[PDB]
Ligand binder design. Structure first.
Ligand code: BCL
Ligand code: BCL
Ligand code: BCL
Ligand code: BCL
Ligand code: BCL
Ligand code: BCL
Ligand code: BCL
Ligand code: BCL
Ligand code: BCL
Ligand code: HEM
Ligand SMILES: [Fe+3]
Lengths: 37, 47, 107, 49, 299, 32, 306, 38, 38, 37, 38, 37, 49, 38, 49, 38, 37, 37, 38, 49
């Protein structure tokens, strides 16, 4: 098969974690929600 | 405003974490390949 | 300010023991600069030599600024940090940069 | 390559045909969502003017 | 199938598939370190995990732990910043001189700098011991000694020669760059320093040589070639092939020479010279051309 | 400036240059 | 299927010159080999030769014109002579006087053609010798930095003055001026990454050279043979670096490490240089807004005064 | 066949992700949409 | 045996000596006790 | 077994020691206790 | 025979192209013809 | 045949993508269309 | 090259013919779309004047 | 034969592309045609 | 070289003749379009004066 | 035995000498005793 | 013979071209003929 | 023989050409002859 | 013999040429002879 | 070394004798010309005074 299961899981997990952290930090820094003072 | 700007976030802290994780992973896999079993000359016979 | 002292200007300040034939820009002080460079005394010095992030200037204006700055260094003996902090040149924190502004307006 | 049609037998493999079908359906859904998003954004704030 | 060191699996020399355990056990041979010759015995002549611990390994580890503790204490306490990119670990003021007082600020900079020096020298001696146990040459100690001498020039020799001891660098992330910038602009046109230029030349040449060697070795790893293809390739382009043993010699020499000339220029700029633009005022006055020009082309 | 201490430190720096020179001389003396 | 004798001893175009090899002697004593040997010329390299020397001739003739055609003054002021680009006015126009930036444009064009043809030469000879083409892509990664410096950065800024002036002292001045213009590259993150990769490259080169020279008594420098089966020298090097820092590599991974250090150096430098002017007009202000600048209220300034 | 499936998939995925990130950055940096506090 | 006696002794001695040095230096520098000229 | 006793002991001891040092340093830095002058 | 047809053709073509480009550049920079700009 | 299909496909795709990106960026930076403010 | 036409047999393979046909249709669709886009952009704001 | 068809095609195509790019850049940067807002 | 003419047999191969014809046709079309574009540009605004 | 007598002798002597030097240096640097004009 | 025909031809052609280009450049830069404005 | 004819010819030709160029440039730059304006 | 004729000839000729050029340049720059427009 | 004198045989070859003679004659001529030039220049302008 073209791709193996481990590669797909690794890429998906890394992308999800990176995007989640980036989005939380961008939203916190934007100062448009009144979150954490 | 206790927090950095978004551009600071990306440009500074994404590359830094990427470099740290990449260095650790590359070192781990380099060590794995180095310590594996493959062809070698016998040290007892080799001088 | 009174911190600098109370020194005044007199004949010997500019003449230095010569009746005539004064030599502003002598050859010994024109070492690294082009031999025909002169101070740009047609500008407004509170903002005359600003180059940082202007985006309407380029390396030629920076070169002219550097010529003026090295002339200011040679005229004293303290190096480029005498009036500046090298981490951020636009800063006004060393207290001899306002003195340099007053000197430039006087000149 | 039993499941591959006659026309695409020299190009595709029995395993790659299924993954290709998955990718095609994913791109179709993505295009539908992109068109809907573009229409909504135009209704919200035009960008050509 | 026989697994090759590169990673190939080539179906079937005197080679054979040997685990790393046999090689690791064979080459131990304890009892040939530098401390054993002096004292007749090495107090720590064993391995803890994969590391070998010797007499100077203990000194190095003590220095490392103490230096890290002092660094964290100056930056978490006495500054109250709580982040490492805004810490600013300063030496004592220039007015204080060459003396150290615990009450005055800047004492923990002394502690950290001394601990770091001890750790660096201990690491160098440990490398010498490990080299001596394996019957190898002493080349890596020479390169690392060049680096350690570069450290000692910046933190010991220059402050003592200038005599005020406030002339050493703060140990702060993003803050030693402030010291570098201010020192470089104090002696304006630090580009025009000859040894700085030689060091930059050697650094760039080192990077280019590393890239060329890596490319050349990687371009022949997994191919059926006769081992002389690389020589023909390197003679057809640039018309010269250094050989196998010359490239590593050139690499080691260039790497050491760059740091040596850099520490020379920093020390010379500290004390014997004041301005690097005035250093070149001797050039145009030499009596081969001092009378050949007119107007702007005079001098 | 105390010119004795400065010259001493300069001598230490030029001493630090020495090991690479010794390595070069050793490589030249061998491989005749 | 490749005859090395033919690839080294052909005649005419698509062949070699300097066919009877020379010998230097002292390079054989110090470096282990002293054959000057023949050099290939195959229509990828004649173009490079002609274009590079056209550019050099233009620059040297402009140097001569700048001193009034006085050879003694030519020797006097050789190292502080330059051919600068057009001034900031008339930003990207080519209708410029020859002494006000006309020669710079022509020389730069010929230099671009020369470097591209040199890359083609490298690629073609790597293909024709039977080896891989890693050197071509490394040179591509350095040409990326070069083209950012000379072509892509002056574009998108609106003037030719954002480029170096073709001189021994002009590159140093360009570096200083670009640093002063856009704040401080000490606070440019890509400058930091490039410095990290550069110093790592130097460190790795020194380590590898010392390691191979130390174990050369067992023929550890024959990389091609050690990749087939390890020998005593490679085993000793692995044991040394395992006992020093706890982990090591073999005689094949270190080359990948070095190649990627150099490539990352070039690429990060190019990206930082391009990003410097178009998006962040002031690096110190950005660093202050990013909380990567240390507070500095009460300096001790007596260190920095004469 | 001229190209393998893996090469096509990898190139397409990388190009799509990079283009999406670049377009989001360019659109949101212009400040012409009033998104997330102007 | 999970660990050897000499390793335990050496590690304990190093940790104790480092802790004692650090604590004496911190207490001396804090200046909260009036010891060795305040 | 996936993990040895020795590795677990080493990791746990190092983590505990580092955490204790960090917590003491942070509490001292905060200046909210009136401890050690 | 001293030279091959290939070498002669390559050298002649390259020389002609370089000379034409240089002459066009010099004529444009001189600004003595009122062409492509006032 | 002189050229393989693969090389032509690769070169055409790369040239087209580079030209598209360059032309879009040039048009956007010209500021003569009233696009994205 | 059984499916390849007689004229182009020495230049094409059987599997390459299909990929070439796909590329040809892609180029033709792109050209039509680009022509339409240019016409609308000219109708919106001329760039020559 | 003197030259291969491959080399002639490659050189001709590359020369044409380079000349087209250079001529476009020179003509448009001259500011003599009023293209995209003068 | 069955399809190559008698005059150019020592210089051309059967596969290369077809690519040569394609290249020549492309060059002739490009030349015609370039001539047309130059004529329109001159009609718009002369560049010699 | 876990440790040899001579190893213990070397370790103890070196540690004692280092500690004595450190204590004299610290006491001198404190300047609290009026020793050597301090 | 000490020299071959090829080397002599190459050297003579290069020398002639270099001299001609240098002479034209010097004559143009001198500004004493009223050529090219 | 200590030297070949080829080497002597090459050295003599290079020296003569360089000296002629240098002398012409010195004479032109000195401005003592009223030649070329 | 200690030295070959070739090396002696080369060294002598180079020394003579450099000395002649240096002396001529020094005399020209001295401006003490009224030669070539003073 | 037939032409080389008896004293100079251990140092010289038969071929180097003639080149040495040429060099000696050239040096003597050069010294004579230099003496004449120095006398002429001194008669023109003394450089010591
Ligand atoms: C600026 C005005 C609007 C806006 C306008 C639009 C418009 C208009 C569109 C989007 C689109 C998207 N927007 Mg937006 N968007 C806004 C604000 C946001 C915010 C936010 C926090 O504010 C977020 C998080 C998003 C997020 C997103 C994404 C959900 C989506 C693009 C996905 C993508 O990358 O596809 C590209 C991704 C890929 C090509 C990779 C796919 C990979 C798959 C999923 C997993 C494969 C795994 C497998 C193992 C891989 C094998 C190969 C490997 C190489 C081994 N938008 C604002 C408010 N947005 C687009 C959309 O709807 O797309 C459907 C779109 O057209
Ligand atoms: C506050 C409003 C903000 C905003 C705030 C956020 C934040 C904050 C986040 C998102 C996330 C996302 N946003 Mg939103 N978002 C906004 C506007 C948009 C717009 C838009 C056009 O306006 C779009 C299209 C999106 C789209 C998206 C998606 C890409 C994504 C959620 C789906 C997903 O991938 O789930 C897939 C996700 C999962 C499957 C996660 C599953 C995790 C499991 C359950 C474990 C959780 C952790 C837990 C502690 C584990 C404990 C046990 C141990 C494992 C043993 N956002 C606005 C501007 N959005 C989230 C994301 O995933 O980003 C990458 C995210 O973090
Ligand atoms: C002045 C008051 C200071 C302070 C000053 C110090 C100093 C100073 C030290 C300690 C040390 C310690 N402090 Mg107290 N300490 C304070 C407040 C506290 C508080 C608190 C809640 O307030 C706590 C919990 C502690 C707790 C502790 C322990 C961790 C430790 C003492 C016990 C120990 O290790 O025994 C176990 C100890 C041993 C088994 C040591 C045995 C040593 C043998 C006998 C050799 C002795 C040396 C001798 C010269 C050897 C000669 C050999 C020759 C061959 C003859 N301190 C205040 C702020 N504390 C000491 C320590 O050990 O730190 C690591 C230490 O040095
Ligand atoms: C003063 C009140 C402060 C504070 C100050 C501290 C300090 C200071 C420390 C902690 C530590 C801890 N804090 Mg508290 N802490 C506070 C509020 C909190 C809150 C909260 C939500 O409010 C929480 C959840 C915690 C939770 C915790 C735990 C993680 C931890 C203690 C248990 C543990 O792990 O033991 C596991 C540890 C052990 C089992 C160690 C056993 C060691 C043995 C007894 C040996 C000791 C040394 C020995 C004497 C040396 C000599 C040996 C020779 C052989 C003689 N703290 C407030 C803000 N906290 C302590 C810790 O250990 O953190 C890692 C610590 O140092
Ligand atoms: C405008 C008046 C300018 C001037 C502008 C120019 C310019 C501009 C040029 C010349 C060129 C030349 N000039 Mg004039 N020149 C001037 C004054 C002079 C004086 C003088 C003493 O006054 C002299 C002696 C010359 C002499 C010369 C020659 C050296 C040369 C023309 C002949 C030649 O080489 O043809 C040989 C040339 C060829 C055989 C070219 C053949 C090209 C083929 C046909 C292809 C053409 C391109 C086409 C698009 C290809 C299409 C198909 C694709 C390839 C598939 N010029 C004045 C100052 N001159 C030209 C030159 O250097 O040419 C090399 C040139 O470019
Ligand atoms: C506006 C008027 C401007 C000017 C602007 C330009 C511009 C701009 C260009 C030229 C170009 C040329 N100019 Mg004009 N030019 C001017 C004045 C002149 C004068 C003069 C007054 O003496 C002369 C002699 C020329 C001569 C020339 C030729 C060298 C050339 C056009 C013919 C050619 O080579 O066709 C041969 C050309 C071909 C065979 C190309 C065929 C290309 C095919 C059609 C594909 C094109 C690309 C397309 C995107 C493909 C799409 C599909 C994908 C492949 C799937 N120009 C004035 C100053 N000129 C063009 C050129 O080609 O320069 C190198 C060019 O770019
Ligand atoms: C300043 C006042 C006058 C002026 C005064 C003069 C005078 C006076 C003379 C010239 C001469 C020349 N001038 Mg003028 N000239 C002026 C302005 C111009 C302009 C211009 C743009 O304005 C141009 C283009 C020219 C051009 C030229 C040339 C035609 C010619 C020098 C040719 C040369 O390089 O020979 C040197 C060339 C070579 C050595 C190379 C020859 C190569 C051959 C032809 C091709 C085959 C090469 C072969 C294949 C190589 C084989 C070996 C390889 C190694 C494989 N003039 C102005 C108007 N000009 C000279 C002349 O008449 O020459 C005949 C001359 O004496
Ligand atoms: C105008 C008066 C100027 C001056 C201007 C010049 C210039 C200008 C030159 C000399 C040259 C020389 N000068 Mg005078 N010179 C002056 C004062 C002096 C004084 C003095 C004490 O005052 C002295 C001692 C000299 C001495 C000398 C000699 C070293 C030399 C001439 C002889 C020679 O080498 O012949 C041997 C010379 C040759 C054998 C040349 C043969 C050349 C062949 C025939 C080729 C010629 C070119 C031809 C175009 C080739 C065509 C075909 C192609 C090859 C295909 N000059 C004053 C200040 N003098 C010339 C020289 O060569 O210096 C190195 C020179 O260029
Ligand atoms: C004008 C008065 C100036 C002065 C100007 C010069 C100049 C100018 C020169 C000397 C040179 C010399 N000077 Mg005087 N000199 C002065 C005062 C002094 C005083 C003094 C105490 O006052 C002393 C001791 C000297 C001493 C000397 C000698 C070192 C030397 C001449 C001898 C020599 O080497 O001949 C041996 C010389 C030769 C053998 C040269 C032979 C060259 C051959 C003949 C070729 C000549 C070129 C010819 C064209 C070649 C043609 C053929 C082609 C090659 C095929 N000078 C004053 C200040 N002097 C000359 C010298 O040679 O310096 C190194 C020199 O150039
Ligand atoms: C030393 C060579 C030196 C340098 C370098 C330097 C730099 C510099 C810059 C980049 C600016 C302008 C930056 C901005 O955005 O404002 C600038 C401006 C001033 N400087 Fe300066 N300077 C150097 C040397 C010196 C010295 C020794 C002095 C004091 C005599 C001095 C002073 C000033 C003053 C005043 C200005 C203000 C210029 C203005 O506002 O027009 N500089 N310098
Ligand atoms: Fe290697």
């Amino acid at each position: 098969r073209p791709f193996e299961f481990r590669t797909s899981v690794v890429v998906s997990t890394l992308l999800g974690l990176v995007m989640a952290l980036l989005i939380h930090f961008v939203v916190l820094s934007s100062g448009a929600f009144n979150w954490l003072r | 405003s206790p927090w950095p700007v978004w551009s600071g976030y990306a440009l500074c802290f994404v590359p830094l974490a990427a470099v740290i994780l990449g260095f650790i992973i590359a070192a781990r896999f380099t060590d794995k390949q180095a310590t594996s079993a493959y062809l070698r000359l016998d040290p007892a016979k080799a001088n | 300010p009174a911190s600098v002292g109370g020194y005044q200007i007199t004949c010997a300040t500019c003449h230095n023991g010569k009746a005539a034939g004064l030599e502003p820009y002598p050859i010994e002080i024109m070492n690294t600069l082009p031999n025909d460079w002169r101070l740009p005394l047609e500008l407004d010095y509170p903002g005359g030599l600003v180059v940082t992030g202007r985006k309407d200037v380029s390396n030629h204006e920076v070169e002219q600024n550097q010529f003026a700055m090295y002339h200011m260094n040679v005229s004293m003996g303290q190096g480029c940090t005498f009036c500046h902090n090298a981490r951020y040149f636009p800063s006004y924190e060393i207290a001899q940069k306002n003195h340099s502004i007053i000197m430039l307006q006087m000149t | 390559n039993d499941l591959v049609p006659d026309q695409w037998k020299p190009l595709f493999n029995n395993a790659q045909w299924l993954v290709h079908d998955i990718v095609v359906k994913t791109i179709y859904g993505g295009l539908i969502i992109a068109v809907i998003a573009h229409v909504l954004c135009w209704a919200w704030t035009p960008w050509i003017r | 199938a026989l697994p090759l060191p590169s990673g190939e699996t080539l179906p079937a020399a005197s080679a054979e598939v040997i685990p790393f355990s046999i090689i690791e056990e064979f080459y131990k041979r304890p009892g040939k370190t530098l401390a054993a010759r002096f004292f007749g015995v090495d107090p720590f002549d064993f391995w803890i995990g994969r590391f070998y611990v010797g007499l100077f390994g203990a000194i190095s580890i003590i220095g490392i732990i103490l230096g890290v503790a002092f660094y964290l204490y100056e930056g978490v306490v006495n500054e109250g910043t709580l982040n490492i990119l805004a810490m600013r670990i300063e030496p004592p003021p220039v007015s204080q001189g060459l003396n150290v007082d615990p009450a005055q600020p800047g004492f923990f900079w002394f502690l950290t700098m001394v601990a770091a020096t001890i750790a660096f020298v201990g690491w160098l001696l440990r490398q010498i011991d490990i080299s001596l146990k394996l019957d190898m040459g002493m080349e890596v100690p020479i390169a690392f000694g060049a680096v350690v001498s570069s450290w000692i020039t910046l933190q010991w020799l220059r402050p003592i020669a200038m005599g005020a001891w406030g002339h050493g660098f703060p140990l702060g992330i993003t803050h030693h760059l402030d010291w570098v910038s201010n020192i470089g602009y104090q002696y304006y046109n630090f580009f025009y320093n000859p040894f700085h230029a030689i060091g930059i030349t050697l650094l760039f040449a080192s990077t280019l040589f590393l890239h060329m060697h890596g490319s050349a070795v990687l371009s022949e790893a997994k191919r059926n070639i006769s081992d002389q293809n690389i020589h023909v390739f390197w003679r057809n382009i640039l018309g010269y092939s250094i050989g196998e043993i010359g490239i590593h010699r050139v690499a080691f020499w260039t790497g050491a020479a760059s740091v040596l000339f850099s520490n020379l220029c920093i020390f010379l700029s500290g004390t014997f010279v004041k301005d690097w633009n005035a250093f070149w005022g001797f050039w145009d006055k030499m009596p081969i051309w001092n009378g050949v020009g007119q107007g702007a082309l005079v001098a | 400036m105390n010119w004795i201490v400065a010259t001493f430190m300069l001598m230490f720096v030029l001493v630090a240059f020495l090991p690479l020179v010794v390595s070069l001389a050793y490589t030249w003396v061998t491989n005749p | 299927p490749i005859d090395l004798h033919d690839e080294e001893y052909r005649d005419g175009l698509e062949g070699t010159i300097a066919k009877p090899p020379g010998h230097v002697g002292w390079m054989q004593r110090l470096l282990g080999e002293g054959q000057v040997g023949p050099i290939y010329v195959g229509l990828w390299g004649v173009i490079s030769f002609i274009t590079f020397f056209a550019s050099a001739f233009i620059i040297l003739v402009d140097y001569g014109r700048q001193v009034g055609w006085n050879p003694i003054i030519y020797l006097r002021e050789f190292w502080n002579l330059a051919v600068y680009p057009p001034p900031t006015e008339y930003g990207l126009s080519w209708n410029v006087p020859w002494d006000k930036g006309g020669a710079w444009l022509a020389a730069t064009f010929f230099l671009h053609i020369s470097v591209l043809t040199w890359w083609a030469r490298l690629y073609t000879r790597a293909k024709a010798t039977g080896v891989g083409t890693q050197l071509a892509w490394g040179f591509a990664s350095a040409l990326s930095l070069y083209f950012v410096i000379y072509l892509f950065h002056p574009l998108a800024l609106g003037n030719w003055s954002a480029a170096p002036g073709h001189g021994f002292r002009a590159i140093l001045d360009w570096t200083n001026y670009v640093s002063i213009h856009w704040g401080n590259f000490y606070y440019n993150p890509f400058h930091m990454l490039s410095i990290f990769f550069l110093l790592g490259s130097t460190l790795l080169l020194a380590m590898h050279g010392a390691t191979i020279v130390a174990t050369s008594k067992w023929k550890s420098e024959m990389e091609f043979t050690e990749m087939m089966a390890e020998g005593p020298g490679t085993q000793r090097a692995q044991l040394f670096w395992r006992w020093v820092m706890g982990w090591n590599a073999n005689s094949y991974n270190i080359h990948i490490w070095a190649w990627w250090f150099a490539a990352f150096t070039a690429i990060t430098g190019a990206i930082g240089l391009f990003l410097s002017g178009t998006l962040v007009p002031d690096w110190y202000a950005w660093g202050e807004t990013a909380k990567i600048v240390a507070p500095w209220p009460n300096p001790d300034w007596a260190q920095y005064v004469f």
